[PDB]
Amino acid sequence: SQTLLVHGKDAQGIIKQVLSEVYDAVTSTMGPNGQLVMIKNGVSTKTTKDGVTVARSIRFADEAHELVNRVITEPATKTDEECGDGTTTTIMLTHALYHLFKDFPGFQHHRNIEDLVERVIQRLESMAIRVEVDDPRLYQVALTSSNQDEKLARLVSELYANNKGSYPDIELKEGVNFEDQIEQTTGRTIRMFYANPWFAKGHQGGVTELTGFTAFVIDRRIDKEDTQKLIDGVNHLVKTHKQHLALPILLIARSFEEAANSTLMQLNAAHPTLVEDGRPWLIPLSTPVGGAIGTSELQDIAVMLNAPMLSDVADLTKLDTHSINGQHGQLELGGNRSILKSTTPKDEDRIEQHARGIEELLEGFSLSDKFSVRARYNERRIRTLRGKLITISVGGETYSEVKERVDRYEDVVKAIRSALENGILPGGGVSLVKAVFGTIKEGLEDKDQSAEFAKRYINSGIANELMRLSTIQHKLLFKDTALYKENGSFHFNDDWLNTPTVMNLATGEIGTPEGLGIYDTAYASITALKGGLQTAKILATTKTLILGEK
Amino acid sequence: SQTLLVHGKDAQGIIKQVLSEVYDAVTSTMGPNGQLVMIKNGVSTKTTKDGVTVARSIRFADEAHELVNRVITEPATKTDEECGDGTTTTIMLTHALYHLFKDFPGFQHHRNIEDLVERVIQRLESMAIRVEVDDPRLYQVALTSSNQDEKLARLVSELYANNKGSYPDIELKEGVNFEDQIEQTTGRTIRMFYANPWFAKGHQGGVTELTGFTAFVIDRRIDKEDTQKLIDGVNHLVKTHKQHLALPILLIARSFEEAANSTLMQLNAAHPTLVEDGRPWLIPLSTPGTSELQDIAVMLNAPMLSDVADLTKLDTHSINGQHGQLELGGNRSILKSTTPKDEDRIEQHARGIEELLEGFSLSDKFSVRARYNERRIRTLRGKLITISVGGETYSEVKERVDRYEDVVKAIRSALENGILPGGGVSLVKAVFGTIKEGLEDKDQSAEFAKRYINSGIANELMRLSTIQHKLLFKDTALYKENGSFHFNDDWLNTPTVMNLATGEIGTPEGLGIYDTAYASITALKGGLQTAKILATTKTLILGEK
Amino acid sequence: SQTLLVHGKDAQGIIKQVLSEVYDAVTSTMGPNGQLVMIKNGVSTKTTKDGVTVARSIRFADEAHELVNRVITEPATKTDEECGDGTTTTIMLTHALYHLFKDFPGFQHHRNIEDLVERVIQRLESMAIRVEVDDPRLYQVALTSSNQDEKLARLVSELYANNKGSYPDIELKEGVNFEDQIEQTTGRTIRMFYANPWFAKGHQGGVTELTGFTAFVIDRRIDKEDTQKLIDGVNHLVKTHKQHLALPILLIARSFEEAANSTLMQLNAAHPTLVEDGRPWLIPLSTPGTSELQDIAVMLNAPMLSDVADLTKLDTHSINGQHGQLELGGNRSILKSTTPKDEDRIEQHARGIEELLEGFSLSDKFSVRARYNERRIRTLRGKLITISVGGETYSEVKERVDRYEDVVKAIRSALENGILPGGGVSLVKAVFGTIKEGLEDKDQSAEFAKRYINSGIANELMRLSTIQHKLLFKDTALYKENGSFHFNDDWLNTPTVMNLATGEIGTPEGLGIYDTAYASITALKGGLQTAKILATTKTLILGEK
Ligand SMILES: Nc1ncnc2c1ncn2[C@@H]1O[C@H](COP(=O)(O)OP(=O)(O)OP(=O)(O)O)[C@@H](O)[C@H]1O
Ligand SMILES: Nc1ncnc2c1ncn2[C@@H]1O[C@H](COP(=O)(O)OP(=O)(O)OP(=O)(O)O)[C@@H](O)[C@H]1O
Ligand SMILES: Nc1ncnc2c1ncn2[C@@H]1O[C@H](COP(=O)(O)OP(=O)(O)O)[C@@H](O)[C@H]1O
Ligand SMILES: [K+]
Ligand SMILES: [K+]
Ligand SMILES: [Mg+2]
Ligand SMILES: [Mg+2]
């Protein structure tokens, strides 16, 4: 509050400082030989090595400093919410790339640094190694992500490897015993969830369990312009077609804005005769689809529940026993996601038939398009359709040791899911070195464009400096070890590039990441570089801080 | 609070400081190097490049400093509320002109600087290109504002060019398909809305749709002093003249205070025989400039009434109930079905407004008077369009929706506010021209030289117009060759800028870089006023009472 | 709040400081010649020698310091909640091992120090001496843990030795007389209690005493979703199978929510013919690890049932009503009369649990898994005893109650887990042994020397085990004046300590100085973990979000 507008040297100075402090703090936790961080919270101390936990909990006293800290940390926090891993690497690159931008100021270099790094990202995306559940490397991924758990990696790799032909959705509950206990189910993690907490059991976003329903899938996003179409629709079914109707009526759609949610709350109050044990007879259910990819996923939700597909909300009126079909199965609605369990063999014929239709669409398209987003999304549909819900109940000697073991399970599930989903890359901070050193040699060697490539990147000094960045992770991991010469030097020659040598920080043996089984998820380490670049550019190109509150 | 009256050197010192800090902050958000600003708000950080956002959110700790900051920033904030764009330019000039006033002190120079800049403003107003929808430059504007979208610019420029004779109001919805889909209507976004949520369908501010009505436009603001005139009025129509009357009865007015709204709720309860499906047969409708109601009157065939008591003395001559189609709303009402009988009455009324603008000065053509009258025309002759944007994902759609909305805003304000060549050029041409005109006119060249040229003002004012062009294209290849000293005659004839998106050099006309005239003119108008103020303040009072 | 992120040298500096201050404070209280600590609390002063009390009550003013203090002390506090003793030793090792980690930095040494100490832990677990109640050493343990109470050790050692064939559960009440008074029972403190006060005698949570019943153990937690399954279940037994049924019907389960409790109140009102002296014929009983219900099932001849709906499908085969004697209670239920027919079923079940532990790893013998299973055994076989401690005053009684409870905890864990020779010796033997084993085994001696001996670790780890023996017997006749004490082979074979009570020198085995193994092992286990943490922390965060 002494000064509320920082500009120029002063502002960048703060950014450089905050970035250095956050970098030093978070990167100290890297690998299994990561050092620890003690964190206050009222009257307790959390000791931890988890980058996402350290990053999220760092705080600065000065408003100006925290202002910047929020920009550095929120992108790290955004990685684990989506990718499930790789915040530390993001911050490390955010730092390293920031200094790269500053070392080559002037906003022609910036255009070039963006272009060069963007090409390095493509070379990672190509390097990505895709794998099947049978593959032995999934263990090695799980092992790396479980902080070297010889026990768990085996279990979860088996679960995936044993169900070859179906991709297991996994849940986690805090168990009771010292030993774990597994429960394999026919359930499906469906992507629908409550529009408003009021529609649940107890009217506060609880987990409503049902043994019968009548769903209807709408496509449109719903807002104040749909409130009348709902009133006409709902009362047309509850008046005319109440005979053949099992409650509740599920209205599954793209989005339910608050103007329409409050309309359907009063439509529930309109017919109090149909309320059983508090359960509202009508529930709006939203999905994070959107776009054309978004239409197909609702079609899956429609097929699983026997509900018809409807383009408009006004189509609710013109319906008949032909188009209305109320199921007597079993469904568990939830705020995060809904889950189906009881599926009559009558239904599973409809589902497997629908899944074959999707499989046939992929059988008749190009090999290049087989690795597209189109194909990958369609396989994401199949595995929703034919998914084997598993519930593991984790256990242990205490309460806290159980809840921590639950977290370590969830880390591994996230890792393995995204491994087969997205790809795996060789670890030990190597893939980035290969990706950069490669991207340089490709443009430097291509005679066609070598002319200008040299002018932009090599001759300017950028290319050289960008090679030195990829070394950072490999240095942070394996400085202060036998793999490095005492003075700190480590040569990244052609011989290294062909067979890159890392050290397993668990055992102590030296070897290749492929040989030693050290692997990273590709979506993490790619998103790390993508996000690192964006948020580095921001920091590097900010010249004004405003702490004015008004 | 240590001292509550600053006078003289001390006061100007504060002003110069605050102005410099605000100038440096806001002008840094212009260009290819154009820098960002990180802004606090409780427990969040807004990163932004938007001048109006930066200006509005700048704060100073010292009372004395913020006192001045309020004067510098409020005129920037006032530009985007009216013009829609151009705050950064206003502040830039406010700064540059302030120093001009201070470099030539003594209040004969000030009279001359005002006079000279006022003449430069006239030379801009003349330079203004009023662009019609047919014009090919609207594409080029849309193209620039769409980040070089070869596809969209075409579509939206066509939409505007294809409806020659009506100005399309455009809405945007997040669609479902990979492809976009357009829905054209003959509708008009009318400025009337519910006085009370009770009068809507379902009695809670919903969207009541109608296929017939009988409107009546009153002028007065309505409160507790009008409750009796309404009771006399409403029952006089519903009793005497019910035969020739389609429900509902719309009572459009300036303002309906809650004392009168509760009276009309009971007047609806008075005649329950006229209630169809819950729809109340009487709706009060308010509007946020007395002739905008005259437009609302003409669109719906309702008569204009000065007093509420005039409701009684009416006849079939003055009562006319429409059987069209109307969608009432809490934000705004929308008309759709318009019989060709009506659209003759509307187009005739629009011509009457157009004729009023044909017989008045060029300086007044950029007034609020003229601009408001054109706002009326486009309400009268408007066509509602709903585009549903689509794409392969969710985020790519919602981002494409934003890129559409940027283009609509640009094209609307382009034809609305008139177009000038961009790249900080038009000001250079306008100043360098104004000098050469007075310097070359032998009649008045005598005194013109004494006032402006010989004093040193003219020279220094040319140097100011260069500011924007410098701030944009310093640190680029366009200033690598010659440098700063090259605004020669050859430049003036074919002014050379750089498209900061692509990287190519060329004319603003060639490269499609254009500014709205009302923005860049208002910038200079406001910049001068608020520069004069700052330059001629010698006392700060932080006495709060 | 001056700074909210400490990193590197600064952070470790704080840790080293806080650890030293806590070490000096707590280790000063060691043994019976332990020095004292005066502790504030509002308007009082607790003088004490109790490590757990000192550790728990230490406070630091600086947030940064207490942040670390919480990490050092919570593991000490966690030992006495589980083990019943040995916090001081934990902290002492936490300190000593921390400095070991720091003396050999680089995280290959750390891997080796962990591996070496982990092997020393195994050598303790093997050294553990297991004891039966008849054994004379239980006295010697009790004597050590009772601060040399010649009177008490005898009593409690007799109580355990006299009930050879049953493990006495012991309670403590603040008595009235100068003399103590013992009350032996055959009973079993069972973990079941009333779900609702209404089901007791007098319908207000009283102590209902019975001489016959028919129990049924359900597993599920019960709520509004089980009310129908109960109505079907209860009436199926009371109608079909009433002949072979002694009232009341006990429904033992995990949890009874209020929705189900009110259902069973009306089911009691349904059959008023079965009400004897107010006693409701049906009582729901809750418990705060699914096999603890299996114990409750086996003690009362009731069957185990997974679902509430399983109540219907039952027969004389599965229904067995006892005619023993049971005292229900709001805190806990108590069994007394057990026909020798039953105690055959119970002892057989207890052997089944004992057999499960007999084929368990030695490391897992000190787990929570094993310790919980022994908690089951002692519920099953035990003879509840209530001692009422007495004395000359109030405070001398309540303090004598605490000294009893210390001894009970010690003796229980002694026979439960094992005993080790005291005087800070067993650790010296365990380390010096572990070295000589690996150093002497030709097979692995090659690499063993490279890792531990040649690096310097092994040497330094031998010097740590000496710490406790030094802290106890420095400043005594057993140590040479200058402070030197030689731990040669001759010492290792017959280790020489001093009884700090009497003053005589001799072996721990000879002088009767013994430690509980689970304490001194858990001390080293926890000491290593929390030393590693402290040694490998480089960042303190005092940020509140
Ligand atoms: N046993 C190992 N030997 C060598 N390198 C390893 C080993 N295990 C993991 N790594 C490497 O360490 C890095 C992983 O860092 P770390 O797990 O500390 O943070 P992160 O995975 O980036 O994100 P988070 O901190 O959220 O886990 C990767 O480069 C990985 O290849
Ligand atoms: N008469 C004695 N002579 C010599 N050493 C003894 C005697 N009695 C106890 N000790 C020793 O003192 C140590 C016990 O320390 P102390 O009881 O002060 O703390 P602790 O057992 O670690 O935990 P707590 O402080 O909670 O009791 C053991 O090494 C034990 O052998
Ligand atoms: N591609 C371009 N090349 C050259 N000049 C541009 C380009 N795009 C925008 N400009 C000019 O730079 C100015 C920057 O706008 P902005 O910083 O938002 O100022 P304001 O907030 O005052 O409108 C615009 O008013 C426009 O005249
Ligand atoms: K980590
Ligand atoms: K003690
Ligand atoms: Mg990792
Ligand atoms: Mg002790």
Author numbering:
A (entry chain A): 2 to 551
B (entry chain B), C (entry chain G): 2 to 289, 295 to 551
From the reporting publication:
As anticipated, the ɸEL subunits displayed the typical three-domain architecture of chaperonins, composed of an equatorial domain (residues 2–130 and 425–552), an intermediate domain (residues 131–188 and 388–424), and an apical domain (residues 189–387). The domain structures of ɸEL differ from those of GroEL by numerous insertions and deletions, which alter the putative substrate-binding cleft and the contacts at the ring-ring interface.
In contrast to crystal form I, the subunits in crystal form II exhibited considerable conformational differences (r.m.s.d. range 0.60–4.43 Å), and two new states could be assigned (conformations II and III). Subunits with conformation II (chains B, D, F) alternate with subunits in conformation III (chains A, C, E) around the ring, with the remaining chain G having conformation I. Superposition of the subunits in conformations II and III showed that the apical domain can pivot by ~22° around the joint with the intermediate domain (as determined with the program DynDom). In chains A, C and E (conformation III) the apical domain is re-oriented, allowing residues 290–294 to contact the tip of the intermediate domain of the adjacent subunit (chains B, D and F; conformation II). This re-orientation of the apical domains of chains A, C and E also results in the αK-αL helical hairpin to point outwards into the solvent. The apical-intermediate domain intra-ring contact also requires a 19–21° outward rotation of the intermediate domains in chains B, D and F. The orientation of the intermediate domain correlated with the identity of the bound nucleotide: The subunits with outward-oriented intermediate domain (chains B, D and F) contained weak nucleotide density, consistent with partial occupancy by ADP. The nucleotide binding pattern is thus alternating in the ring, with the exception of the adjacent subunits G and A, which both harbor ATP and Mg2+. Interestingly, in two of the ADP-bound subunits (chains B and D), the tip of the αA-β2 loop, which cradles the nucleotide in the ATP-bound subunits, was remodeled and flipped away from ADP (compare Fig 6B and 6G).
